[PDB]
């Protein structure tokens, strides 16, 4: 289609291809919604290829793509308004990922990223995450948002809130964490879980629709890896790192006591101890402002000084007036 | 009932004083049902109307109030109603620096794990409090720790020892807002909010590093914000900017089961 309708071939091909850019994005998202567990390979060979074509289309048809991308965000919000999580689908997760491919994620303001980030922060929070399907959906969401800030490394409070409830959810309460609001108490992992077998931490998208303990563990393992990565990159830089990590530290302590064999929390805990030791937690001082100068004001002057019209009439009267007496005299 | 009690019920009763025991019991409700944990928030409004109208009292009001502030407050849809009442209570002229300092430090602590909508509420709310009670500038900044180029080498050595020996004295578990030692602490939490992902929120947090020229901010311009309003607002932006791209290229958006955009995520 692109070759048949290149801009040079005819006038008006640019708008057709630009409209086609919007059309192609919906198809890429559309295919992900369709079931593909049967021919995951063939889907993988179509899905990535179509993204590459959009990348070429985006390079010249950005405005068409950006308009469509914003439209999907509004549609996603509208569907979330009535269906809540039921609106959310695999293609929705895919859609955010493609925006990351094609658009500059780490900007203070962007047309599509700034909406896209706040949509995911929404999904990170009001979504109750009371099902392993929903928790896995959030785990994918955490990875997407964490990468949008791979360079900015800005602070997302929802990531902090999301981790705490998910971390506590799998130990259900221990009676020492009443400040964290859980939405499910039946997802607590069994004590018999080995936590020494090599369980794959990769979460396939297609498994999400199908969705036990290993699935619970696999979802849990990925979340810490996101948690551990964020500590090293974002939270470490923040001035309030200690306050951010204290509730996480307490939750991580629960894993080690309950599951001694489980090593991931201990590695994070050992790392967290290292960061707090080096960081010098000193009272901030931000109101130290540079002194202000005395006022400076420009002089008022005429470039060529002279040592309204009614006033001149008066002076010329006086001169003309004055002369008259001397003749009269 | 509690939501409409203050407005559509009290003014129409002949002897509204009869409601207090219902309201005080409501304000003192503690239950294992989490959905009942919001009851003191709603009951507070009706209780204050009775106290205002007939000069009626609730014991240890601020100490009970300090307890009600919790992370759940930042996420309930009734957050906006609560803070409006907080403005009135914390506008009192007989409030000690320590009492105000505790409300400051706890709220800043809660903002770390708060929705931006709540953060948008707190950042002006705190500026009003700090402005009202000037003694609390210690928590934003303490001049003792500032370094001057002119300071002698001995002063440099003394300053170094002071930095080493500092410890945060603020206690999170103390329920008496006068004893938390917040005034001796600092608001590291607000500084982190300067790096908030949302640009407009970060600019609000940036205000604390700026001179406190403004006298106050209208809370009602800040209270009833939801993400959907943030979504409607960004779409209805006054200024339109050209979209930008990523020169960096990823071969695969998702990881397998060359360049992978989302390692740890596969189809």
């Amino acid at each position: 289609i692109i070759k048949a309708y290149q801009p040079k071939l005819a006038e008006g091909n640019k708008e057709k291809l630009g409209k086609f850019t919007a059309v192609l994005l919906r198809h890429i998202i559309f295919l992900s919604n369709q079931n593909y567990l049967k021919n995951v390979q063939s889907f993988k060979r179509t899905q990535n290829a179509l993204i590459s074509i959009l990348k070429s289309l985006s390079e010249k048809y950005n405005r068409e793509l950006s308009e469509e991308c914003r439209d999907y965000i509004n549609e996603m919000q509208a569907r979330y308004k009535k269906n809540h999580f039921d609106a959310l689908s695999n293609g929705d997760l895919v859609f955010f990922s493609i925006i990351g491919i094609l658009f500059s994620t780490s900007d203070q303001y962007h047309l599509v990223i700034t909406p896209a980030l706040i949509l995911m922060s929404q999904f990170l929070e009001q979504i109750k995450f009371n099902s392993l399907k929903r928790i896995a959906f959030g785990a994918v969401l955490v990875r997407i948002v964490s990468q949008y800030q791979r360079i900015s490394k800005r602070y997302i409070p929802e990531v902090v809130y999301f981790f705490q409830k998910i971390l506590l959810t799998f130990i259900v309460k221990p009676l020492d964490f009443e400040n964290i609001r859980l939405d499910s108490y039946e997802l607590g992992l069994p004590l018999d879980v080995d936590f020494t077998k090599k369980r794959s931490t990769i979460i396939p998208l297609h498994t999400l629709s199908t969705m036990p303990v290993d699935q619970c563990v696999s979802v849990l393992l990925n979340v810490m890896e996101s948690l551990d990565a964020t500590i090293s990159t974002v939270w470490k830089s923040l001035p309030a790192f200690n306050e951010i990590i204290l509730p996480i530290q307490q939750l991580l302590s629960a894993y080690t006591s309950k599951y001694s064999d489980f090593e991931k929390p201990r590695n994070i805990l050992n790392k967290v101890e290292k960061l707090t030791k080096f960081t010098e937690h000193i009272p901030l001082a931000l109101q130290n402002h540079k002194p202000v100068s005395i006022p400076t004001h420009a002089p008022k002057y005429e470039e060529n000084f002279n040592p309204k019209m009614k006033a001149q009439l008066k002076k010329e009267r006086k001169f003309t007036m004055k002369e008259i007496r001397k003749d009269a005299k | 009932i509690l939501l409409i009690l203050h407005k559509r019920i009290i003014p129409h009763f002949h002897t509204p004083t009869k409601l207090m025991d219902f309201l005080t019991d409501s304000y003192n409700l503690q239950s294992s049902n989490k959905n009942a944990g919001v009851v003191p928030i709603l009951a507070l409004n009706g209780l204050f109307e009775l106290m205002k109208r007939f000069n009626l009292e609730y014991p240890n009001f601020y100490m009970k109030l300090y307890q009600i502030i919790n992370p759940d407050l930042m996420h309930v849809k009734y957050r906006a109603r609560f803070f409006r009442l907080m403005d009135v209570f914390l506008s009192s002229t007989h409030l000690s620096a320590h009492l105000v300092a505790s409300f400051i430090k706890k709220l800043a602590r809660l903002t770390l794990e708060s929705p931006p909508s709540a953060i948008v509420t707190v950042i002006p709310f705190i500026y009003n409090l700090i402005r009202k009670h000037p003694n609390c500038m210690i928590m934003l900044h303490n001049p003792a720790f500032i370094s001057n180029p002119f300071q002698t080498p001995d002063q440099v050595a003394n300053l170094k020892t002071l930095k080493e020996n500092y410890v945060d004295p603020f206690d999170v578990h103390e329920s008496d807002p006068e004893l938390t030692h917040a005034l001796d602490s600092s608001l590291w939490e607000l500084a982190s909010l300067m790096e908030h992902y949302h640009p407009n929120v970060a600019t609000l947090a940036k205000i604390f590093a700026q001179p406190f020229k403004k006298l106050s901010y209208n809370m009602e311009d800040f209270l009833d914000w939801n993400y959907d309003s943030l979504l409607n607002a960004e779409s209805s932006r006054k200024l339109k900017t050209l979209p930008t791209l990523e020169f960096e290229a990823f071969t695969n958006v998702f990881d397998n089961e060359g360049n992978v955009y989302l390692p740890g995520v596969a189809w």
């Binding site: 780490s106 203070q108 | 050209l242 930008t244």
Partner: peptide, 30 residues
């Protein structure tokens, strides 16, 4: 050049080269 443009956009240079603070006028007021 893309990288020096990149770091500017990291720091608030928004291409209509305005600033984010400009976007923050009247946002909360309505």
């Amino acid at each position: 050049e893309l990288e020096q443009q990149r770091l500017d956009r990291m720091n608030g240079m928004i291409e209509l080269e305005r600033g984010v603070e400009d976007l923050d006028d009247g946002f909360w007021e309505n």
